[PDB]
Amino acid sequence: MIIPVRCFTCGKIVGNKWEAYLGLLQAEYTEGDALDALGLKRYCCRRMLLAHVDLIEKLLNYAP
């Protein structure tokens, strides 16, 4: 729905890396370089931000 504040496996704050990851993919990085350059080195931390469907930009369209 929204990015988790912590990675599930190890408790790294990955919840501050969603806007500054969209900003790197909009500025033409590959995803194999937009995750190393945010400091996500373990593949449990990369997993949280690579495979994330941010399903609240689709859910706020139904707003009063």
């Binding site: 194999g32 190393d36 080195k41 373990r42 593949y43």
Partner: protein, 51 residues
């Protein structure tokens, strides 16, 4: 106006439209094979061992 009968007809010609020639090509046209997966270029170790 009597309309008398006649003899037996020998043969019966059947007129029909011809077979569809030059419709199929002499070689066949298959769907091309989906390619085998490639190892992508630019793969390197991004994980360094800590400390």
């Amino acid at each position: 106006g009597g309309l008398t009968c006649a003899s037996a007809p020998q043969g019966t010609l059947r007129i029909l439209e011809g077979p569809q020639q030059s419709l199929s090509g002499s070689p066949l046209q298959p769907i091309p094979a989906s390619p085998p997966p490639q190892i992508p270029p630019g793969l390197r170790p991004r994980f360094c061992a800590f400390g």
